[model samples]
Target: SKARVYTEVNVIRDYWDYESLIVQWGEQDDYEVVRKVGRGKYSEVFEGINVNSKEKCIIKILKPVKKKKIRREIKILQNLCGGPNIVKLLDVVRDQHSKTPSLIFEYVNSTDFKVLYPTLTDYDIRYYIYELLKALDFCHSQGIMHRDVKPHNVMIDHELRKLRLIDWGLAEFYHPGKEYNVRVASRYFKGPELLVDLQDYDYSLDMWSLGCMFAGMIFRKEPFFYGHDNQDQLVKIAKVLGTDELNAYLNKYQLELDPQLEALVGRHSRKPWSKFINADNQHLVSPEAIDFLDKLLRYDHQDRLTAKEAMAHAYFAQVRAAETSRMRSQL
Candidate 1:
């Protein structure tokens, strides 16, 4: 099914334009790497500084990847530059000889999620998740899909209460009827649509990824689904959501699971959401939270809540009220 909103924006040449872009590369000398902060298959990330402004920045030096992939990342970043909670792209530079390109982004003094999530109060979780949905809604409205949405891609400045959705390397413009690479998103966050090889997925894909994160946060489980491999990922999902629902999802999509996968995903009963709640996370898990999570984790991508819809869920009522009160006070 088509996205409930922004369904035709990509058909407009101006909004989808990227390949024809003529980029003016920034000077690599302007930014100096301060320290290596992270590494990924596509790039080596460094904490850096702008020589002129003497301000901190993040420099992600790209490895040898296709030119189009690099251009898409930079272009998407450029398009969503000022959207709420979206990471700001500062500049793009390249090594003259090697043509090794790098993306510079505004520095976010972030604490690792492994350390930060556990420290969050229940209200804190609602607040940050709401912030994340803002970014997702903005990107989706702009006709872009952030194929990679996970904790590592989200940089949180807890002290400042800021959440920046970073790493646009895998993001792409959403064209209706277009088939996307199935090899996108982390295995654990991948939606059932992705696992079932449904290439015509839309914005709902990110909603599923967000649901995985929400489950982990409220359940106090770092990764709610610990799958060893891609095939196993579906198995893990079936184990909780139940094989019956999985079959129903496949039937609705007119998809057939791989014979081997079907074997691995043998009959299983639906595990109640309450079963996941425990003394450690009881405070975080509420009826509202469960209801919201249920809407996002549906096996059918279309059945999943849109970012805008998810943001208005009753789970975030407290957050909305607090923000309203705060805004009134500032006035």
Candidate 2:
């Protein structure tokens, strides 16, 4: 008997071709590609308009098909549709000839939080984190984990200052009965459990990444002491949090430490944040910010705060109130 491969085609009904869809609106070239808004490892984002609707939108075109990238993105976006803090997916279209897919999303004319950090005041940081927490709370309720939650992935409307969590390529859904691998998030933003390779983990990974973003907002720098590669990354983390701390935390889980990790930690020469970032930078942040950051940056993932708890924390409450007062005064 010959070996057989099963091919499955999941056709989305009434899917429109990009050219035909563009023509349906009439007035070809009505919405010009104004400028490139963002560039990622796989796709390029361009700002566009709907001539008929006079609505601004972003066009994210696929560069090439990679393993499970587009499918994973579409799945995550579908799961996250209709949220105030999440960017809306207007439509998904395929090229007429090449069949390359493109996603049309609601246009946000604001800069990324990372780019806007230098200009952000103490209050601005608070408002940003509040919005981010609200979005994360909603996602967590739906069992969706935004594995990559960094400042760069957060977009703020220039006028409204509303935050939108973008880029779902790294998101994963955690179901009640399903089992998933421990690793998914970006290395620098990864939690200790994932970095150290633990067996059981959950939404706490996202919280850890959130902590990294908080650190970035406060210090205007990357949080993790890690480098590019896995070994160097571990060394950086060990420097700040310390290998002894990691050993103690992992010991509770009975997780065996990798020999490579032990070797790298022994050779790590990077100094801790206490030596690099000054007291002003560290203490300049709001007290609530410090409390929340500390809670999320725990060595054990289980020790991290939940999204709802973090949202209700004093830090976000104070900032949210200030933002409201400021907006009311302006009005």
Candidate 3:
């Protein structure tokens, strides 16, 4: 019997065509780096400007990595370029002698989420989270999982009420039942499946990441888990979600926790979600929000809500209704 495969039908081939890979590399002199913006192990990102248009852009110059990995990112970016809430990929270029590749993306006049999240009104959270859901749902529907879905990867232009999901380097095409690399996402946003050494993880991995971000935003706990290491991260989660159900989660998949992990977590009852709400954050707390979050931050990945389903959840009832009214006015 043929195993179920989630691979998209219109892929390059059984192998990638090398000639198709040779997209024109724009001259390095065409764009000027305005300033340093951010850095990652894989790339250094800069605020830049296209000399031709005088328009701001982002120049993401790659560091040493597998050429296949770089091509994978370019392919995914070009494929999803015009997606609903996705950041646009403007070009892919390279250094002549060094052969170092660079990705050019349309600039997002974004405020760092750390600085902006604190000032958000209740509706701002509702609106932007929904906007993010659009991007996630669009990508998932196209059979891709954004392995990283943390706050930093989401760009928000608050004044414009716009949100764009960026960074595709870690994203991958989902092929059901295929085991993937466990060491894919960052520690703080890693799902239970990744931490538990589960390999056949799927799109729900991102839902877990989204849940982590959502929980932090609402509760005002910087990281929400505050784990220092992978092992400690599991213990942190087990402390809040408890060990009893995590055992059930393991049993569901016929797997067991490492003895070291079992010994460390000991026992803990599931903490009430309400415990996180208080004078400072209670304003953002509501029944719908709690229920929505409860569904997302589950130990069982399958139990987490899909992005499309999450968009229609009661937590977004006000935003959905308001959006509908605005559409009617435009019509």
Model 3: clashing residue pairs? Answer: none
Q: TM-score for each prediction?
A: 0.97, 0.79, 0.93
Report the lDDT tens digits of candidate 2 across residue range 77-114: 76679865998877676655665667778887787555
Better-scoring candidate (lDDT), 1 or 3: 1
lDDT of 1 by residue, 121-240 (tens): 899999999999999999999999998899988999999999999988899899888888889999899998989898889989999999999999999998998899999999999999
Worst 10 residues of 2 by lDDT: 1-10
Q: Candidate 1's C-alpha lDDT?
A: 0.91
Work out candidate 3's RMSD over C-alphas: 2.8
Clashing pairs in 2: 225-236
lDDT of 3 by residue, 272-329 (tens): 9998998999888899989999999998888888898899899999899998999999
Clashing pairs in 1: none
**Full candidate order by TM-score, most accurate first:** 1, 3, 2
Q: List per-prediction Cα lDDT, in the order shown.
A: 0.91, 0.69, 0.84
In candidate 2, position 297 carries an lDDT of: 80
Q: Over 4 Å off in model 2, which ranges?
A: 1-34, 64-68, 176-178, 181-183, 267-283, 320-331
As a TM-score, model 2 comes out at 0.79
Write the candidate numbers in order of decreasing lDDT: 1, 3, 2
